[PDB]
């Protein structure tokens, strides 16, 4: 399991938590020195438990699929909550079994459905460590509309920060003041699968992407990524989604 406490958190402690979340995910090999997530994990071992504590010390436990860093559901006190989708229904066979009841949220866990339920796109929702405190608070007691926005904050401050060093650094900048995500943050979040695929294909193509990937950089400009010497490959991406998924 991994844990993070908002009480006493600072950029260093968050950075160390994200390093620890990455290290909790299994891999058999690295590609261009980036861990390659596994194609598949059978049964309960597929799920990592992430214990999150708000400023006031109240907690939720979040279930994360270790093959794709996808948040499936969470436990708050005696109630489990799962996204309305088959992978999350499967997870509910393995995690939080001792909850007194299980609620299926009235949306899947993809960005498209969460943004419709929240009534706002990611671009308009401030993120940061205060926002994560608020999100844990919101998720402690059921509210499906408020929960959708809380889950967008939770996903971006945990899973997306694990996937990209840049996004970790953006949340560190927001340790004490929330701010809507940068243009590059949205671009990277949207591109993880594509980048993963191209970096794995590059291993048999002399480091060259078979299909260049368009990103927004840290200055807000559009750039074309063509090969593994790009800083997005050498410094930024931290985990690769296996091409088998
Ligand atoms: C490979 O990527 C590097 C770093 O972004 C870039 O400078 C270079 O132009 C790329 N090479 C080709 C042939 O696209
Ligand atoms: N539920 C989720 N978990 C992790 N990353 C996601 N990206 C969009 N939805 C996600």
UniProtKB/Swiss-Prot annotation:
PROSITE patterns: SHIGA_RICIN (PS00275). One of its GO terms (molecular function) is toxin activity. Keywords: Glycoprotein, Hydrolase, Plant defense, Protein synthesis inhibitor, Signal, Toxin. It catalyses: Endohydrolysis of the N-glycosidic bond at one specific adenosine on the 28S rRNA. It holds the Pfam family RIP. GO terms for biological process: defense response; negative regulation of translation. Its EC number is 3.2.2.22. Transmembrane segments: none annotated. Glycans are attached at residue 227. The active site is at residue 160. It is an enzyme of class 3 (hydrolase). PANTHER family: PTHR33453, RIBOSOME-INACTIVATING PROTEIN (PTHR33453:SF34). Belongs to the ribosome-inactivating protein family. Type 1 RIP subfamily. This is Ribosome-inactivating protein momordin I.
């Amino acid at each position: 399991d991994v844990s993070f406490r908002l009480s006493g958190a600072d950029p260093r402690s968050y950075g160390m938590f994200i390093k620890d979340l990455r290290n909790a995910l299994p891999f058999r090999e690295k590609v261009y020195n980036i861990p390659l997530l596994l194609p598949s994990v059978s049964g309960a071992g597929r799920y990592l438990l992430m214990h999150l504590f708000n400023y006031d010390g109240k907690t939720i436990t979040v279930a994360v699929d270790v093959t794709n860093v996808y948040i499936m559901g969470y436990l708050a006190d005696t109630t489990s909550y799962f996204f309305n989708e088959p992978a999350a229904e499967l997870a509910s066979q393995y995690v939080f079994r001792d909850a007194r009841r299980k609620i299926t949220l009235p949306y899947s866990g993809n960005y498209e459905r969460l943004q419709i339920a929240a009534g706002k796109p990611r671009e308009k929702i401030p993120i940061g460590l205060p926002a994560l405190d608020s999100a844990i608070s919101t998720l402690l007691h059921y509210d499906s509309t408020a929960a959708a926005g809380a889950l967008l904050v939770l996903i971006q401050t945990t899973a997306e920060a694990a996937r990209f060093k840049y996004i970790e650094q953006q949340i560190q900048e927001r340790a004490y003041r929330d701010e809507v995500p940068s243009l590059a943050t949205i671009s990277l979040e949207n591109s993880w699968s594509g980048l993963s695929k191209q970096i794995q294909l590059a291993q048999g193509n002399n480091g060259i992407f078979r299909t260049p990937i368009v990103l927004v950089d840290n200055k807000g400009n559009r750039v074309q990524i063509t090969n593994v010497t790009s800083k997005v490959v050498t410094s930024n991406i931290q985990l690769l989604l296996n091409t088998r998924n």
